[PDB]
Symmetry: C3
Subunit: 418 residues, 3 copies
């Protein structure tokens, strides 16, 4: 307290800190529509066919000495296909081995394939022509039935809010498979067991809103919403559709079920690493600030303690009286007091410090004065996630792949039907 008076600077006033209105807003009870189908649908897959070798032996002289070979693949019709499913069995015609002479014609009798009921059956590539001056016939049948699964994809229109369940091939393209008409594709016959069925559900959900477009401080740049402890982006108010589900705030190749790459995982991993280090930086940046503030509160204490001998005791929550030596340093002595002071008189005529009989009140029943707000933080439990299969994993498509492969193998091992 010895100062140059000829240098008074001012007038001054303490700069209060900016209280910024939050750009991220929590909105409760946001109305949301969920539309969902079965992950996969039951598809009846059936195939049929025969390999035939009709031959005639007139010796080397005859131009009619030949072995005509055919491998017909047949379609299976709606009613048969259904029957096949019900029965977990498929129907073929009779196996004709070495039917020669006048029996050469058993071959042309049945081209639908009737009378044999098997679990399944594969061709045998049988052929012979060792009956001189005669025709020889061999005709082997193949057969297969499966009620397999194929992946659904739900889709809804923002125009009309109408939805449809698409059935996808191994590559993510929808395919025309219906309940009323058999589809013939990849050498096979396909029909739906069930008309594809969906369902809607209405909810009120908690959404985090973000308004960080400086030009449009009211435009909502991102919205994250809690659907059953799982987070979703619903910023765009178009229908949001993936796999078997569609969500909204009240035909080309689909792509979500494509196989993901290790490389994109690793980037998500780096993003996670980043988030962790981002958490640490900001937490510590906040830590440091508070500590600075804490220390200001210290400078406050030492100053006001020179007048208030019992303050340090209060702060430490233990009754002790302080005696200062400098502004900086001080001493402590133990104390304990009669705490039952509930009125403010005894035989009163301005008695105690800070100056303490209607001007004489008992304060047993008093109320808390709220001069502060507590902050409340919103960090809900998350992580109820679903994993979906890639589109190349459909049980139905591998079934189709299997019979295709089985045919390839049997049709290259020639058999003698004698």
């Amino acid at each position: 307290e010895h100062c140059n008076a000829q240098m008074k600077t001012g007038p001054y006033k303490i700069k209060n800190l900016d209280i910024t209105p939050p750009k991220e807003t929590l909105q409760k009870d946001v109305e949301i529509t969920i539309v969902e189908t079965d992950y996969n649908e039951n598809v009846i897959i059936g195939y049929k066919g025969y390999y035939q070798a009709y031959a005639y032996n007139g010796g080397s002289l005859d131009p009619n000495t030949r072995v005509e070979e055919t491998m017909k693949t047949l379609n299976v019709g709606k009613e048969d296909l259904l029957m096949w499913s019900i029965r977990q069995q498929c129907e073929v015609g009779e196996e004709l081995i070495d039917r020669w002479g006048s029996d050469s014609d058993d071959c042309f009798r049945d081209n639908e394939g009737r009378g044999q009921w098997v679990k399944g059956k594969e061709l045998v590539k049988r052929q012979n022509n060792n009956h001189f001056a005669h025709h020889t016939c061999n005709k082997s049948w193949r057969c297969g039935i499966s009620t397999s699964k194929m992946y659904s994809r739900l889709e809804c229109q923002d125009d009309t809010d109408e939805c449809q369940v698409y059935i996808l091939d191994a590559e993510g393209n929808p395919i025309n498979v219906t309940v009323d008409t058999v589809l013939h594709r990849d050498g096979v016959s396909m029909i739906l067991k069930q008309k594809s069925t969906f369902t809607t559900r209405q909810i009120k959900a908690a959404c985090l809103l973000i308004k960080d477009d400086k030009n449009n401080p009211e435009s909502v740049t991102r919205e994250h919403c809690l659907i059953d402890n799982d987070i979703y982006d619903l910023s765009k108010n178009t229908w949001n559709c993936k796999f078997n589900r569609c969500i909204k705030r009240k035909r080309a190749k689909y792509t979500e079920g494509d196989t993901a790459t290790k490389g994109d995982l690793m980037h998500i991993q780096e993003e996670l690493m980043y988030e962790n280090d981002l958490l640490k930086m900001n937490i510590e940046l906040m830590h440091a600030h508070i500590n600075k503030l804490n220390n200001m509160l210290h400078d406050l204490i030492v100053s006001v303690a020179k007048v208030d001998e019992r303050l340090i005791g209060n702060l430490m929550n233990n009754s002790v009286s302080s005696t200062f030596l400098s502004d900086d340093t001080f001493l402590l002595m133990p104390c304990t007091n009669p705490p039952a002071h509930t009125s403010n008189c005894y035989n009163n005529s301005i008695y105690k410090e800070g100056r303490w009989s209607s001007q004489c009140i008992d304060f047993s029943n008093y109320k808390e004065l709220a001069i502060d707000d507590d902050v409340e933080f919103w960090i809900p439990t998350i992580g109820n996630t679903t994993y979906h299969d890639s589109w190349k994993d459909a049980s139905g498509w591998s079934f189709i792949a299997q019979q295709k492969s089985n045919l390839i193998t049997t049709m290259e091992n020639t058999k003698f039907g004698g």
Copy 2:
């Protein structure tokens, strides 16, 4: 205030809190080089071949009675391959069915395959030998052309900062496919439409730096950098290369495009769950600390309010005067004041409290005194990510797979060419 004097402890001084210099540093304007190619490159894929059955019938007696079968796969040359691409068509020779007698030799006339232009064509495995004392020839042609895509992989050397675009097979290995020479592989002929072209881009980017090696408190253990609202690790100052892009702060199997596993997803999911719970713990740990501090500030208030009757009013931002009963408890009365006091005199001779005519100043124009720093938090918008296809999804490789399969099927259905 009744204390044991014989127990003075000290001298004491209030322990200030450690202000830790931040280990995570933000560095602005970090110079960065981006090198990028097309995700995929256009590859002309062409294939050709014939199946031939040259037979002679001299009866069972003749050892020369035989059916010689061959299936040649041919190479397609640079110029033809280009022509094929331009024309979306491929060229084959004439289809020879049942050419016997003196026409047996049509077979050997054309082995290049000229004169027929088709969109594409598959073999027919035709054969016969029913012309006694004569040779019989059948020769069927196959044909295919596609200008498909195959995935690029960029690579740069830290030595010399030279880059190259590699074209990968379905397994992630580079393959020698050039603009000047046709590559013959997997029974097919391949050439590039275009010389592989890249491009560079220089940027200044914001990077988060981390120095958490206790032994080397200056070594930078991790660096995360913002490239167009997407986060990258550039701690190592080697070239960072994935898929079609390379980044740097100014031949074996590649691996990023391998298919990722559900299991590694789930771990990333658990890491996310962890981060969320890590956020909650630390936020609340900070919450609690501040509340403790807030309550200290309360003990301060009650003490200094015994001298300052208008303080509580100021804090609550409403004019009220306080009267204390104990140290703890107090009463309130309403007030409102004339706020236009801009000088500090009236007819002044030490008038108001705290003691308030050159010693008499008007303070209309005053300045804010900055005794505090605001903290500033760095949490930029992220999430502009790219997804890449797995290496088994290249349109070009499935084309090659397709023709391979088509050949397999046709070469096991024998036809009679009579």
Copy 3:
């Protein structure tokens, strides 16, 4: 200070803020058992077979004029299979081309395949019957050996804490492949080079514990544990097993190695986006609160500065004296003081302010009074992650796929063995 006395409200007391006991607890030195096997195991894969065409030519008259074709696939036995591995070679019988007449019987001599040692070998589908009144024999051999890899899966029982290493097929099912018995599957013979071996490791690890079930405030709803700078969920105290490793706090299709989808990646991406915006909201929500608190500390300052002229100087850490004009506004003058005051006397009789020779102490050696706690934040380094291959990538299964394909191709190109 002019107030309506007829409206005293009270008695009041300042509401302290709730200090909430943390629901997320850090527990150190949690005992954990790790069990681990090799990622993959060495599997000896061997295959063998022949294609035979035994024919007889008695002319068109003879019913015995026929070409009997067979393609046997053989099993390879334990000892041979081992020998094959050691030698990187496989054994076949002699190639018989056009052995006719009395040599027709070379065909039936050797059906095991002995005497030829090759790196590998493929069939040639050779056949002829151009020797009148004689049998003709052709028999070609195929051969293949690989010591390939197949993926391990570790599994442990909570009952008995016994573990086993399973060897998986391309679809994630375990297969019965042992050291003592050859397995015959997919037209091939398989045996283990090595008995499958695991190993255990005990650690003490730091775990984050969470108790957020309101009904059971002691139940531990989630536990995240650090295993070598990588985070794991060990809430459930069952064995946790994925791929080749099992962890615990002291046969159907396995699924972790299935291919993950782009769609599930994108959701993880949205979760990350969410976390970032969640970090920002909460950080800023905390920022705002502190600033409010900071400003309270300002109202405190101005009040107590009216009594303490040197306080503002202390806070700003520079010696200056304050003179007030209103309650709000003030002026500053420069100062600097003799700081060596280490006793509290000179020629003392109640000298300085706040009232400052055994009642006369030197304070060179004083101690810091801890009236505060620093908070300590726990954000450990993470991100030592492992990536695993999908189950369709096993070198051993593609080897099996390869020979299968090679056979398909050779068995549809007929050759004349004359």
